[PDB]
Each structure stands twice: as structure tokens, then as C-alpha cells.
Amino acid sequence: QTLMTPYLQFDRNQWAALRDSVPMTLSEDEIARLKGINEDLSLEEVAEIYLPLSRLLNFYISSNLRRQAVLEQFLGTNGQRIPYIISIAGSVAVGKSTTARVLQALLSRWPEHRRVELITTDGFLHPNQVLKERGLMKKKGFPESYDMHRLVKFVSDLKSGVPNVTAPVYSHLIYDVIPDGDKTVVQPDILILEGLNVLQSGMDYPHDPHHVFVSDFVDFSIYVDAPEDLLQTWYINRFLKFREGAFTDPDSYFHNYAKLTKEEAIKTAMTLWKEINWLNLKQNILPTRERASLILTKSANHAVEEVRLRK
């Protein structure tokens, strides 16, 4: 078998096989916290995939702390609680949120940190008002719909030792950044950053370039992959269910999508996909996959089929 990439390859079996000295199981409580998270997520999927994943990440995080100690000694450094940041990328409705939320659950179970914050990139979009002014609100999720000078600043601050760093928050009810709903990140041990753009660089923002990227401040990055045809279906389904804020909202900017019949809805969904989002993926997201530390490849039902980890 001849290939050889910068990645170690594992098919489902090989992954769900990895056992570590001292058995991996999940207590009652954990088992609960997760069904509330997605409930479409099977416990077997969690045990076979994410449990071992979290185990993997812990080795990485732990090795880091060990290093912190050695160095803190060598150069004599007071304190400064610099959190370990793990980012999660991928296309729309790929499971970015779910994965993040799940890892945050499991990762807390380690006495080495146990403290894990989670910030989703959506909060860093330009408020609908600004988007309307730039004629971008059918383009939410494109490099121009993001204020990532602010985002890079966020993780930059976190990695700078700034104690309490605040972050904007996006609402899935009114689908707009919450006016005065910014969240305060109080020195966490681990910060998980979920979003479509966590892997992008200034090369993706020529209209307003930046020279130090989000990745420059992220310790470990995870990209959630899936074949195009699948991404299409998942996108469509999200639309079907959310109609892009069409619902929850007096008469959302896209209130008109409410009246759409199923046939019309999916008809619309894939015009939006084929003409907008499919290109966002193809040219702004997909190209960053190889920039990830670990790549998860899913099957039609979100089951993880492959796992690639940088050598």
C-alpha cells in the first residue's frame, strides 16, 4: 500500500480499537450531559470515537503542562494562566457545535484541567445591520461577514495572559449577534473555539488583510470532513429546519422563507447552496482542511468513519 501524507490514518475499527493502559468508560452523570447535547448522538458513537479522542487530546494537553513546569522553572515565571486552545472547523451543519460541546463535556472530567470554555465563531459575525449595509446577509459565513480582526484579537488576548477577555455572542433565536450579550471568559484551562473560519488566514481576507492568524494562537485544531454530496444534504436539512431564521422572529429578514412549502424550501436551499455556500466551502473552507491537526471524516449519518492525525 503506497500513499504517505503528513497524516496518520485510522479507519473506524482501528480507532475504536485503541485501548489505553487503564480502561476508558463513562460515568452515569457524563452519560446524561450528552443526551441533552444532541440526543441524535449515540452513546456507542461517543464511547467508540469521542471518548478516545478526548483521551488523545489529554495526552497533548498534559504533555504541554509538563513542559510549562520545566520552562517556568528554567526562566522562573510567576503564573499567567495561558489556556490551551482547541479549534474545530468544517462546513455548515457538519457537527462543529456538537463535537465542541461533547469534547468540552469529556475534557472536563480530567483533574488536570477540568475547566473548559467554549466560544463559537458565529458571535464574531458583523451584526445584521452592518451586513445589510454591505449587502451580505445571504453571505453570512463568508470572510467578509466576519469581523475577524476582533476574533484574532480575542485568541491573541487569551494567549497574552489577559485575565478576563470578553467575546460577542450570536443568537440562534434572532440570528444576529446579541446587542449586549457578550460573554466573559474567566481564565479557563482549555478554550474550545468552534466555527467555520478557525483555519483561515489573511489570504482569505484580501479586502481587509491580517498578518497573524487564529491558528497562530491555537494549540490543536480539528477539521470535520464529509463528501460534498453529504454536506449538501446536511445544509439542505438545516435550511428545512431553520429556514434561516425565517421562523423564530416577528418576520425575520428572511421571514418570507416561512411560507415556502417543503418542495419549494429544498428547491431554495439548494439554489443557495449551489450558488453561494457551495462556493464558500469549495474556496474558503475546504482548502484549509490540510491545515488542521486532526481530521474527522463522517458518513451519511454523522458516524465517524476515518481519523487522520498529524505525524
Cell numbers standing for residue 35: 443526551
Structural contact between residues 249 and 255, judged by C-beta atoms closer than 8 angstroms: yes
Window 53-82: residues binding a second copy (CB under 8 A) = 55-56, 59-60, 63-64, 66-67, 70-71, 73-77, 80, 82
Structural contact between residues 202 and 73, judged by C-beta atoms closer than 8 angstroms: no
Say if residue 93 carries a ligand binding annotation.
Answer: yes
Window 42-61: residues binding ligand ANP (CB under 6 A) = 45
Torsion of CA 153, 215, 88, 233, to 10 degrees: 100
x/- track of binding to a second copy for residues 203-222 (CB under 8 A): x--x--x-xxx-xxx-----
Minimum gap (Å) between residue 154 Cβ and ligand ANP:
18
Binding site for Mg ion (CB under 5 A): 97
Residue 154: C-alpha distances to residues 63, 160, 213 (Å) = 25, 10, 11
Window 251-310: residues binding a second copy (CB under 8 A) = 287-288, 290-291, 309-310
Structural contact between residues 188 and 115, judged by C-beta atoms closer than 8 angstroms: yes
For residue 307, the cross-strand partners are 10, 296
Answer with the entry of Mg ion, ligand ANP, a second copy, none that 21 interacts with (C-beta below 5 to 8 A by kind).
a second copy
Q: Name, in order, each residue with C-beta under 8 angstroms of 300's C-beta and a sequence gap of 6 or more.
A: 230, 233
Strands 176-177 and 220-225: unpaired
Q: Does 96 bind ligand ANP (CB under 6 A)?
A: yes
Nearest CB to ligand ANP, comparing residues 123 and 188: 123
Torsion of CA 287, 200, 299, 12, to 10 degrees: 100
Structural contact between residues 241 and 182, judged by C-beta atoms closer than 8 angstroms: no
Structural contact between residues 177 and 169, judged by C-beta atoms closer than 8 angstroms: yes
Q: Does 93 bind ligand ANP (CB under 6 A)?
A: yes
Nearest CB to a second copy, comparing residues 82 and 178: 82
Of positions 117, 302, 307, 308, contacts ligand ANP by CB under 6 A? 302
Of positions 38, 68, 108, 297, contacts ligand ANP by CB under 6 A? 38
Q: Does 311 bind a second copy (CB under 8 A)?
A: yes
Q: Segment contacting ligand ANP (CB under 6 A): 92-100, 103-111, 153-161, 268-276?
A: 92-100
Q: Quick one: how far is CA 23 from the chain centroid?
A: 28
Of 221, 284, 280, 234, the C-alpha closest to 88 is 221
x/- track of binding to a second copy for residues 82-121 (CB under 8 A): x---------------------------------------
Say if residue 132 carries a ligand binding annotation.
Answer: no
Say if residue 97 carries a ligand binding annotation.
Answer: yes
3-state secondary structure of 279: helix
Residue 96: C-alpha distances to residues 4, 87, 191, 193, 198 (Å) = 28, 10, 15, 10, 11
For residue 119, the cross-strand partners are 193
Annotated binding site for ATP: 90-97
Annotated binding site: 90-97
Binding site for a second copy (CB under 8 A): 4-6, 8, 10, 18, 20-21, 55-56, 59-60, 63-64, 66-67, 70-71, 73-77, 80, 82, 156, 159-162, 201-203, 206, 209, 211-213, 215-217, 287-288, 290-291, 309-311
Binding site for ligand ANP (CB under 6 A): 38, 40-41, 45, 92-98, 238, 302
